[PDB]
Design an enzyme around this catalytic site. Structure first.
Site, PDB file in Angstrom:
ATOM      1  N   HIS A  61       0.836  -1.383   0.079  1.00  0.00           N
ATOM      2  CA  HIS A  61       0.220   0.112   0.034  1.00  0.00           C
ATOM      3  C   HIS A  61       0.960   1.367  -0.053  1.00  0.00           C
ATOM      4  O   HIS A  61       0.337   2.501  -0.095  1.00  0.00           O
ATOM      5  CB  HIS A  61      -0.965   0.043   1.253  1.00  0.00           C
ATOM      6  CG  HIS A  61      -0.489  -0.168   2.531  1.00  0.00           C
ATOM      7  ND1 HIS A  61      -0.404  -1.755   2.984  1.00  0.00           N
ATOM      8  CD2 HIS A  61      -0.104   0.488   3.456  1.00  0.00           C
ATOM      9  CE1 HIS A  61       0.211  -1.301   4.268  1.00  0.00           C
ATOM     10  NE2 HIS A  61       0.641  -0.311   4.387  1.00  0.00           N
ATOM     11  N   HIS A  91       6.835   7.318   4.969  1.00  0.00           N
ATOM     12  CA  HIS A  91       6.291   6.929   3.907  1.00  0.00           C
ATOM     13  C   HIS A  91       5.534   8.083   3.372  1.00  0.00           C
ATOM     14  O   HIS A  91       5.499   9.109   3.802  1.00  0.00           O
ATOM     15  CB  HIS A  91       5.225   5.640   4.229  1.00  0.00           C
ATOM     16  CG  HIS A  91       4.346   5.999   5.081  1.00  0.00           C
ATOM     17  ND1 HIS A  91       4.291   5.995   6.506  1.00  0.00           N
ATOM     18  CD2 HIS A  91       3.183   6.552   4.935  1.00  0.00           C
ATOM     19  CE1 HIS A  91       3.292   6.506   6.970  1.00  0.00           C
ATOM     20  NE2 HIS A  91       2.566   6.748   5.941  1.00  0.00           N
ATOM     21  N   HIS A  93       2.022   9.176   0.448  1.00  0.00           N
ATOM     22  CA  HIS A  93       0.735   8.885  -0.027  1.00  0.00           C
ATOM     23  C   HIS A  93       0.745   9.774  -1.330  1.00  0.00           C
ATOM     24  O   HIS A  93       1.146  11.114  -1.363  1.00  0.00           O
ATOM     25  CB  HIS A  93      -0.402   9.290   0.923  1.00  0.00           C
ATOM     26  CG  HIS A  93      -0.370   8.459   2.293  1.00  0.00           C
ATOM     27  ND1 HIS A  93      -1.180   7.084   2.224  1.00  0.00           N
ATOM     28  CD2 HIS A  93       0.337   8.642   3.344  1.00  0.00           C
ATOM     29  CE1 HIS A  93      -0.878   6.858   3.542  1.00  0.00           C
ATOM     30  NE2 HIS A  93      -0.243   7.800   4.325  1.00  0.00           N
ATOM     31  N   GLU A 103      -3.198  13.506   1.742  1.00  0.00           N
ATOM     32  CA  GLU A 103      -4.151  13.153   2.731  1.00  0.00           C
ATOM     33  C   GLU A 103      -4.837  14.205   3.231  1.00  0.00           C
ATOM     34  O   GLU A 103      -6.183  14.479   3.136  1.00  0.00           O
ATOM     35  CB  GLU A 103      -3.553  12.299   3.698  1.00  0.00           C
ATOM     36  CG  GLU A 103      -2.883  10.810   3.028  1.00  0.00           C
ATOM     37  CD  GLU A 103      -4.053   9.801   3.427  1.00  0.00           C
ATOM     38  OE1 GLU A 103      -5.179  10.035   3.191  1.00  0.00           O
ATOM     39  OE2 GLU A 103      -3.559   8.706   3.388  1.00  0.00           O
ATOM     40  N   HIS A 116       4.826  11.447   5.475  1.00  0.00           N
ATOM     41  CA  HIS A 116       4.412  10.989   7.062  1.00  0.00           C
ATOM     42  C   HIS A 116       5.668  10.519   7.394  1.00  0.00           C
ATOM     43  O   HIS A 116       6.223   9.356   7.050  1.00  0.00           O
ATOM     44  CB  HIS A 116       3.299  10.131   6.998  1.00  0.00           C
ATOM     45  CG  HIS A 116       2.071  10.565   6.624  1.00  0.00           C
ATOM     46  ND1 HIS A 116       0.879   9.973   6.313  1.00  0.00           N
ATOM     47  CD2 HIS A 116       1.762  11.869   6.303  1.00  0.00           C
ATOM     48  CE1 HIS A 116       0.039  10.753   6.153  1.00  0.00           C
ATOM     49  NE2 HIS A 116       0.559  12.064   6.038  1.00  0.00           N
ATOM     50  N   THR A 195      -4.000   6.872   8.818  1.00  0.00           N
ATOM     51  CA  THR A 195      -4.954   7.309   7.807  1.00  0.00           C
ATOM     52  C   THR A 195      -5.157   5.946   6.948  1.00  0.00           C
ATOM     53  O   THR A 195      -5.844   6.129   5.859  1.00  0.00           O
ATOM     54  CB  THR A 195      -4.389   8.440   6.836  1.00  0.00           C
ATOM     55  OG1 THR A 195      -3.052   7.842   6.173  1.00  0.00           O
ATOM     56  CG2 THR A 195      -3.925   9.566   7.311  1.00  0.00           C
TER      57      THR A 195
HETATM   58  S1  LIG Z   1      -0.747   6.883   7.707  1.00  0.00           S
HETATM   59  C1  LIG Z   1       0.308   6.567   8.972  1.00  0.00           C
HETATM   60  N1  LIG Z   1       0.514   4.907   8.918  1.00  0.00           N
HETATM   61  C2  LIG Z   1       1.654   4.889  10.290  1.00  0.00           C
HETATM   62  C3  LIG Z   1       2.280   3.668  10.380  1.00  0.00           C
HETATM   63  C4  LIG Z   1       3.536   3.343  10.884  1.00  0.00           C
HETATM   64  C5  LIG Z   1       4.080   2.078  11.234  1.00  0.00           C
HETATM   65  C6  LIG Z   1       3.196   0.858  11.081  1.00  0.00           C
HETATM   66  C7  LIG Z   1       1.927   1.014  10.746  1.00  0.00           C
HETATM   67  C8  LIG Z   1       1.396   2.470  10.544  1.00  0.00           C
HETATM   68  C9  LIG Z   1       1.815   6.317  10.843  1.00  0.00           C
HETATM   69  S2  LIG Z   1       0.990   7.441  10.122  1.00  0.00           S
HETATM   70 ZN   LIG Z   2       0.439   7.669   6.115  1.00  0.00          ZN
END
Ligand SMILES: S=c1[nH]c(-c2ccccc2)cs1
Ligand SMILES: [Zn+2]
Length: 256
Positions: A61, A91, A93, A103, A116, A195
């Site tokens: 994703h 990461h 989006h 987002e 993020h 998110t």
């Molecule tokens: S959107 C966002 N996804 C996360 C995340 C980090 C590590 C494992 C699962 C989710 C923080 S904000």
């Molecule tokens: Zn994120």
């Protein structure tokens, strides 16, 4: 499982993750005129000089750049935060087109992408326990617009062809996240959630007002990644973002 398509996308998430309809969901639209300057916010402190990246992973994703968070190194503190939060990963989006992908939105404006940078509250000992707490995570959100290239992003862009499909990872050492930060640390902040599923309501969001510019070529390379695994029909990894959610009983505070 969950995804971003017609049959498993954001409109479906609440069935497996009922918190999707909860009281502090993210992202949200930031109404710049209604957000109030808060003089009680302390200065924000982003200390990334010792950040040590380990690996980059396509998880089906997005792609995650992971850091060694076993020592007190890359730290976010100050601003709305009490105590210290340790960088664990980042990461993005992004969209299928430059006109969408972020987002959060700003007066309904969608940016081409959103970064993020994820940090966990050290008072909880590790990430897995932090995500169970309402103040467990601090996420620094940075908008991306298409224009000039961001030189500090190029090392990420160049590695993506080695992690095209779900489940691929690659060594990714010595990446400096300082090269991804805009000049200004002016920000908006509000209490929210992840998110993506599991949509946990554990995030203090710190969204920078100043976007970074990336080139069209750089974001086009993000859009060459795949949601599917190797040897599966190709579905381009694009539009891995969630619609803005109801603000409900929340206030967005401005640092400026
Ligand atoms: S959107 C966002 N996804 C996360 C995340 C980090 C590590 C494992 C699962 C989710 C923080 S904000
Ligand atoms: Zn994120």
């Amino acid at each position: 499982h969950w995804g971003y398509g017609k049959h498993n996308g954001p409109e479906h998430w609440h069935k497996d993750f009922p918190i999707a309809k909860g009281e502090r969901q993210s992202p949200v639209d930031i109404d710049t005129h209604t957000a109030k300057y808060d003089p009680s916010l302390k200065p924000l402190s982003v200390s990334y000089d010792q950040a040590t990246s380990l690996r980059i992973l396509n998880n089906g994703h997005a792609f995650n750049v992971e850091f060694d968070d076993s020592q007190d190194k890359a730290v976010l503190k100050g601003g709305p935060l009490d105590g210290t939060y340790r960088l664990i990963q980042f990461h993005f989006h992004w969209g299928s087109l430059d006109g969408q992908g972020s987002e959060h939105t700003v007066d309904k404006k969608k940016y081409a992408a959103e970064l993020h940078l994820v940090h966990w509250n050290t008072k909880y000992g590790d990430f897995g326990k932090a995500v169970q707490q309402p103040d467990g995570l601090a996420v620094l959100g940075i908008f991306l617009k298409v224009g000039s290239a961001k030189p500090g992003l190029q090392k990420v862009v160049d590695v993506l062809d080695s992690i095209k499909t779900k489940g691929k990872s690659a060594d990714f050492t010595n990446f400096d996240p300082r090269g991804l930060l805009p000049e200004s640390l002016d920000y908006w902040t509000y209490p929210g959630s992840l998110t993506t599923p599991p949509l946990l309501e554990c995030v203090t969001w710190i969204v920078l007002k100043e976007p970074i510019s990336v080139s069209s070529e750089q974001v086009l390379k993000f859009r060459k990644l795949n949601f599917n695994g190797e040897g599966e029909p190709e579905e381009l990894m694009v539009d891995n973002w969630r619609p803005a959610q109801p603000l409900k009983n929340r206030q967005i505070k401005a640092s400026f």
